[PDB]
Design a protein around this ligand. Structure first.
Ligand SMILES: CCC(O)(O)CCCCC[C@H](NC(=O)C1CN(C)C1)c1ncc(-c2cc3ccccc3nc2OC)[nH]1
Ligand SMILES: [Ca+2]
Ligand SMILES: [Ca+2]
Ligand SMILES: [Zn+2]
Length: 367
């Protein structure tokens, strides 16, 4: 039936700024929040302010040296850490900005607090739109991500769950999460992503895990222009087979919105309904679920996507006519919640989609 949803948000998150021209805009988290408050969704869910995750929490995965560096680096002392910045991949994609560590602490705090709430059986779903920073590595920042809140939240779930399923619908491969759990069967990682001349360059369908983790990493490489019809026809069958074979007791779903049509960095053609169908599919399995954010660089569409996905989590129908909100002008010229796909060609032929699905099904038979 309808589920209890706990949602995490810190009113300060929108003020962190990656710098002029940087596509990552934490302000999109505040737009999302303001839009869902204006739809009245706060009447149906418990809203929590995450704590600032500590160094003890972050070093459950990250090295002590990398966390010490993130805690120390500031725009005023950057000149003294030139060597350390290179070592930890802090620079152009992952800049040093005022309050960087606190931004990591809030992003991580929401994901870890949500996993604790799920472990305690105090909620059916936990939502942290400021989380989902799937590229961060044990001792390195990558692709706008510094602390891997997902790996930390999964480690928390593993205290009570023998098997955890991670699903990543961001247009980019979930490499940091896959890497962390590559050699274990206690976490199965499933990523759908654009593959070929695209960041991070990993996620080939032939990357299936190693050692005890062999067959516990699943990658669905896609080409430009995938649409709702093509995505929907492979997502439900793959996730259904994974659920059947793997039998997880908890799920983490990274909802990166850069897989939507019109994304500044993405080249897919999904609508908000097509992206949210992934949430609907995962919800039907009735397992404790942690829903996280991720990419999304056309910020009006990120706010629409995550507002609608929160409504889906709540089984709450919301009107297409957008309510007035603090960012109303960002949603012009239509002022509607739902988006239209573009006329871009879908390079993912139906035969290509079926063939990759069949190749992944062969790997799932090995569980
Ligand atoms: C949250 C989860 C997520 O998965 O959504 C993150 C996506 C991360 C994409 C990183 C990618 N980095 C690479 O290609 C690099 C180069 N090589 C050495 C690795 C990428 N694309 C686009 C950008 C990009 C980065 C910028 C940085 C500063 C200013 C403008 C910028 N303008 C940009 O683009 C207009 N940088
Ligand atoms: Ca992905
Ligand atoms: Ca694994
Ligand atoms: Zn992305």
């Amino acid at each position: 039936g309808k589920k209890k949803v706990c949602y995490y948000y810190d009113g300060d998150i929108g003020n962190y700024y990656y710098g002029q021209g940087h596509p990552m805009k934490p302000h999109r988290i505040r737009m999302t929040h303001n839009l869902l408050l204006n739809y009245g969704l706060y009447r149906k869910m418990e809203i929590y302010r995450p704590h600032k995750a500590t160094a003890e929490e972050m070093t459950k995965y990250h090295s002590d040296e990398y966390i010490k560096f993130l805690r120390s680096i500031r725009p005023d002392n950057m000149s003294e850490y030139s060597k350390q910045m290179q070592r930890f991949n802090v620079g152009e994609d992952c800049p040093v900005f005022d309050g960087l560590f606190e931004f990591c602490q809030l992003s991580t705090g929401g994901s870890v607090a949500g996993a604790v709430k799920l472990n305690r059986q105090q909620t059916d779903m936990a939502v942290n739109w400021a989380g989902g920073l799937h590229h961060a590595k044990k001792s390195e920042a990558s692709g706008f991500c510094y602390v891997n809140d997902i790996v930390l939240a999964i480690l928390e779930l593993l205290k009570y769950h023998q098997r955890v399923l991670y699903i990543d619908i961001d247009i980019h491969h979930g490499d940091g999460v896959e890497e962390a759990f590559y050699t274990t069967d206690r976490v199965m990682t499933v990523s759908f992503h654009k593959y070929g001349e695209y960041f991070p360059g990993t996620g080939d369908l032939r990357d299936i895990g190693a050692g005890k983790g062999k067959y516990y990493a699943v990658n669905f490489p896609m080409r430009d222009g995938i649409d709702d019809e093509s995505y929907g026809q492979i997502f439900k069958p793959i996730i259904s087979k994974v659920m059947e074979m793997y039998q997880p007791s908890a799920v983490v779903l990274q909802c990166g919105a850069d897989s939507l049509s019109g994304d500044r960095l993405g080249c897919f053609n999904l609508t908000v309904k097509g992206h949210a169908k992934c949430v609907e599919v995962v919800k039907t399995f009735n397992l404790p679920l942690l829903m996280l954010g991720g990419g999304g660089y056309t910020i009006r569409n990120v706010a629409r996507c995550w507002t609608y996905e929160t409504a889906v989590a709540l089984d709450c129908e919301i009107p297409n006519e957008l309510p007035y909100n603090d960012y109303f002008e960002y949603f012009g010229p239509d002022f509607k919640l739902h988006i239209s796909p573009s006329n871009m060609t879908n390079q993912n032929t139906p035969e290509y989609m079926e063939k990759i699905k069949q190749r992944l099904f062969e790997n799932l038979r090995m569980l």
